[PDB]
Structures are given as C-alpha cells and as structure tokens.
C-alpha cells in the first residue's frame, strides 16, 4: 500500500556513510546518567570479580590437567560438568583459553555445534580454528583445511620445541551423535603424531555422556570428570556479596527482590538474565530525573545538592513519604519555608540524606545480627540466609508477624549453654562485620559509634546471663528494643525521602521484563474498552457481545463459544445477525484471526475451520 513496502524486495538499506553512544551531548552531561553509569560499572566489576573467584579453582585444576598431559593410543579428555545454563558459562572456557596462552602450554580451538552439521564441516572448522589460533597468537581457504595440512603445519612449526592441541566442545548435548563419534574416532586415530587433548561441556550428567558414546567410541577414551559449582550457589553469592553490600547507595525493595529471585529460582538458572533485570531496575530508578542523581556517596551527594535546579525540588516534593515529613511538624513558618521558597528545603536536605544512609547501614548491621541469632535455630521460620530475612523485614514490620512469635516460642525454650553459645557467636559475627567491612566506608564511623555501645550493653547482658531464668526475657526485650525496633524498621517506617534510594516501582518492571503476549491479545480480544477507552464498547461481563464492538472482537466472541470444527456459513450468518461489504469484512476478520494463529483452514474439508486454542 505504501511506497516503502514493495512486492520484490524484503530488505531496505539506508546506508549513511558506513565504512569498513546513541545519545548526544544533552544526556551524557546530565548528572543522573553519570551516576547511573558509575554505579553500574561498580556493580558489574564486582559481579565479574566474584565469578572469577568462583571459577579460578577448577580453572587451575584444568590447567594442571592439560600441563600434566603435556609432560607425558587413547586421547585424554575432561568432561567439565557445567550447569544447564550453557551461554552463562561459555566465558569460563574463554578464561581457560587465556591461561593456555599464559604458559604457552597448548593451542585452543572451540568447536561450536552450529558449525558442525557434518563430519567434513567439523574437520574443516577444527583445522581452521587451530591454524587461525596460530595466526592470531604470533588466509587459507576452507577447501584446503584437512588433517594432512594440520600434520604438515605441526611438523613444520612445533616439532623443533610438546605443544598440546586442546579441542573445546562447549555444548556437548546439542551435537549430532554420528558426527561426534566420527570426530572422536578421527582424533583418536591421529594420537602419537599430534598431541590432542579434548575437553567437554556436558550440562546434564555423566549418564548422558555414557549413553551417547557407544562401545567402540568409549574404548578409546580416558575421561576425568571436573565439577563446577552450581547456579543457586552463585545466586546466593551474588545476592550476599553485591546486592546486600553496604557500599552501594542503590537499594532494591522487598517486592523487586522477591520478583527477581522468583524469576531465577522458578524459571531459569541464569545469572545473565538476573543481571540484566537488575540493570533495568537500576536504569528505571536513575532515569527519574536529575534529582535522582543524589543516590551516591555523601560528598558527591552534597555536591549534587549544591547543583540542583528548580524542578528537582518539585519532583522530590511529589514523593508519598515526603508528606509524613510535612504533617508531623507542628510549626507553620517552617511549613511555609519548606513548601515554596525552594532554598529552606535545600538547607534541610543533607540531614535527611544522612538519616537515610544511616538507616540503611544500621538496617544491614541489625539484619546480620538477626540472621546470626535466627539461623542456628531449628525449623527456621524467619529464613536461613540473609535474603529472605531482608525481604521479610523490608516488606512489613517483622515483630507483628506470627513467624516472629513462633521464632520467639522456639527460641525461649532453649537451655542456657546453647543459648549463650548462640548469642556469643552472634556478637562475634556482628563485631566481625562491623570492623571488617563497615569501617573503610565513608560515614561508617557514625554507624559503628551508634551500634557498638548498644552491643556492649548486650555483652553485659550476656555476662549477666552467664552468672545466672528471668534474665532471659530481659535479654530478649533488650534485643527487641535495641536491635529490632529502632534499626529494623519496615519500608513504611522509613526516613522521609527514602524513595531516592529504594526502588519500589514493580508494575512497570514486571510488565517490561516478563513478556506476556497472550495476555495482551486475550485482553484486547475480549474488551477493547481497556485499550480504546471508548464509550460504546464497554462490557459489564466479557461475553455480552455488544454489536458496536470492533470487528475482530465479534468474530472472536462468535467462534469462542463453539466446538473444535467451525462451520463457516453459520459463522457468517451469526456475524450478519450481530451487525456486498459485510462479506468482505468477515473475510478480512477471518484472515486477521488466521494470521495470529487462532484458527486455520482445513485441508481435507472445504469451507470449515480448525481452531488452535482451548
């Protein structure tokens, strides 16, 4: 219809100076983009460092295996028991490649399953990968990529020095069976002349390896199993060392934390998707204006306070927790001063920012103390790890919950020796957390000066229960008033401008990360009044079938009530009874409903339809 859409071409090029940041200077000089980029770079470097420290032990074991095979017929292979998330783990092999080019120990070729449909293509990919790895470390066509040229090249170059030939198979399950068996027989035929080491990337278990390898193929295999750590362990490591770290100013809420952990633990064991979801949360939080650039460290917070414009005051006054700051003051002159004059609030702001930072630091410290107090208990109602206690104490007031009363019941029944051991371990862990990580942080001396005399009061309570039944309730109420009531408040008991740090917008993130096409199609095919906001298409119930609806909705509500095989003529008569041109409208609506995959035409039968839903 349009001059852009044609009947011959499928692609259209708009090349403007192509040879062989999208945003300009307007967005990059704004402070919120710089603080977002800085926070995301910090968090990404931290999670990358944690992944390297997780992988380095079995990486060193693989390098020791390859070098021990080099210091030495069947070929030595090494099944690397990785998880079900293969594109989460491929960078693992990448790091191993650099280690094999650290000591000049071996030559690395990565055989992907997509480039190995046949045996001929797999052999060409292997020889081309080894030769171009040689050409990259220090062009032939793919027609002359055979094992004869590889043996001539290896006799020409590396005989004078043994350099191993490592063949990495990252996706072992996705390979063809016959191509894999012929490739293993080819690599086992050439041993003695070319030193081959084979590693694998098996995801499921070793039973798949022993099932897909026959008797004659496994007769020439000397495999050794290596096990990498699991994906929920990596989730708990990332969630306890990065997202609950006190040195970042951006805090997630309880709802978004539960939503992201639900996506991980229920749908896919991918650290990559969790990281991109947290990045989208960080982006949608920081892109709320230049006033949201204050969610950083304290000196830069004071600088951005002294940098703010006029509308930033009017967008930090729109927060729903700013009104508990206004209504709770009995003054009037201060109300006039902070509502309009745009500078009295600019002077009152840094005390509120410092109160928010102190509240989050003391929240993390009291959460560490509470999870050491609760984790040693049997049956663990409040949660074993730190993250479920984080969700349960941010989502509501924890003392009003029945699970805290169940924890108090199961905790108050305990004898004095295990009780004093638990509280001594709790004080040791809390002071260890206070001096090992809190002290090098900015504005961390004030948090230690708040918590530590209270902790010494708890220590005198521990000595008082050492020298002593009725002191136990005194110690428990002292825990409740000194740790849980003042420093473990819910999100509604927060400091008044905590929306600058806590990200609570969950609906837009939930609808822009989790994708529901079928829900939108079903909603727009039941009632278009949800979308068009028209005043003749409204429905009290979603099956009333009002005649002035859009044309696809009537056809949907007509075939929705019938059975599997839909006759077309009574369909057309029903559409003519609800509402030349009407036959063309019915033909267009049937074509639109077939294009979306809701019905289809029958092949054995003429003038009927088969519906594809249920």
């Amino acid at each position: 219809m349009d001059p852009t859409i044609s009947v011959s071409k499928g692609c259209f090029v708009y090349k403007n100076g192509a040879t062989r940041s999208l945003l300009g200077k307007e967005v990059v000089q704004q402070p919120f983009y710089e603080e977002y980029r800085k926070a995301w770079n910090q968090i990404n470097d931290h999670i990358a460092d944690l992944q390297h420290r997780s992988y380095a032990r079995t990486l060193e074991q693989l390098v020791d295996f390859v070098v021990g095979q080099a210091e030495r017929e069947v070929l030595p292979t090494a099944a690397l028991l990785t998880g079900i998330n293969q594109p989460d783990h491929l960078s693992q092999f990448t790091a191993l490649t650099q280690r094999l080019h650290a000591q000049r120990a071996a030559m690395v070729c990565v055989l992907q399953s997509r480039d190995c449909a046949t045996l001929k293509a797999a052999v060409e990919t292997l020889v081309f990968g080894l030769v171009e790895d040689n050409a990259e470390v220090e062009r032939l066509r793919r027609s002359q990529c055979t094992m004869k040229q590889l043996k001539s090249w290896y006799t020409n170059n590396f005989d004078s020095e043994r350099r191993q030939l490592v063949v990495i198979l990252p996706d072992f399950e996705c390979f063809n069976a016959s191509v894999l068996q012929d490739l293993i027989l080819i690599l086992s035929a050439h041993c003695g002349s070319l030193p081959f080491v084979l590693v694998l990337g098996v995801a499921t278990a070793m039973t798949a390896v022993h099932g897909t390898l026959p008797y004659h193929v496994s007769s020439k295999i000397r495999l050794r199993v290596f096990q990498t750590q699991a994906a929920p362990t990596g989730l708990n490591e990332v969630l306890d060392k990065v997202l609950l770290s006190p040195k970042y100013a951006f805090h997630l809420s309880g709802k978004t934390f539960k939503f992201l952990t639900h996506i991980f633990l229920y749908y896919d064991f991918s650290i990559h998707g969790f990281i991109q979801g947290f990045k989208y949360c960080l982006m949608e939080h920081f892109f709320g204006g230049n006033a949201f650039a204050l969610c950083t460290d304290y000196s830069k917070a004071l600088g951005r306070i002294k940098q703010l414009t006029h509308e930033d005051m009017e967008t930090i006054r729109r927060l729903p927790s700013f009104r508990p700051y206004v209504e709770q003051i009995n003054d009037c002159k201060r109300i006039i001063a902070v509502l309009t004059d745009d500078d009295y609030l600019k002077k009152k702001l840094p005390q509120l920012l410092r109160d928010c930072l102190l509240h989050f630091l003391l929240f993390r410290c009291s959460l560490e103390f509470l999870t050491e107090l609760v984790g040693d208990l049997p049956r663990c109602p409040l949660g074993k790890l730190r993250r479920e206690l984080y969700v349960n104490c941010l989502n509501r007031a924890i003392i009003s919950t029945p699970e805290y009363k169940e924890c108090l019941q199961m905790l108050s029944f305990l004898s004095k020796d295990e009780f004093v051991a638990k509280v001594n371990r709790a004080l040791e862990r809390t002071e260890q957390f206070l001096v090992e990580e809190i002290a090098p942080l900015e504005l961390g001396e004030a948090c230690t000066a708040v918590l530590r005399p209270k902790l010494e009061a708890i220590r005198l309570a521990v000595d008082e229960v050492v020298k002593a039944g009725r002191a136990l309730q005194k110690t428990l109420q002292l825990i409740e008033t000194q740790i849980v009531q003042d420093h473990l408040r819910a999100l509604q008991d927060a400091p008044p401008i905590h929306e600058l740090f806590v990200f609570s917008d969950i609906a837009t993130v939930r609808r822009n990360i989790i994708g529901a096409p079928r829900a939108a199609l079903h909603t727009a095919l039941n009632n278009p009044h949800f979308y068009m906001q028209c005043k003749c298409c409204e429905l009290q119930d979603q099956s009333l079938l009002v005649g002035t609806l859009p044309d696809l909705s009537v056809v949907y509500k007509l075939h929705l009530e019938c059975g599997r095989m839909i006759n077309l003529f009574d369909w057309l008569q029903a559409f003519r009874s609800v509402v030349p041109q009407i036959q063309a409208r019915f033909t267009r609506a049937v074509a639109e409903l077939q294009f979306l995959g809701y019905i289809k035409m029958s092949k054995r039968k003429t003038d009927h339809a088969t519906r594809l839903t249920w």
Binding site: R317, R318, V326, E327, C332, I336, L339, T340
Partner: peptide
C-alpha cells in the same frame, strides 16, 4: 489526595497562623 490540593490545603492552614 493529589499533590496540588494537599499543598494548597497545608499552605492555607499554615498561612492562617
């Protein structure tokens, strides 16, 4: 309650004192 209505209500309440 909207922001402008509550703002005008607090301003009229505090300017009367």
């Amino acid at each position: 309650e909207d922001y402008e209505i509550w703002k005008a209500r607090m301003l009229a309440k505090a300017q009367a004192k």
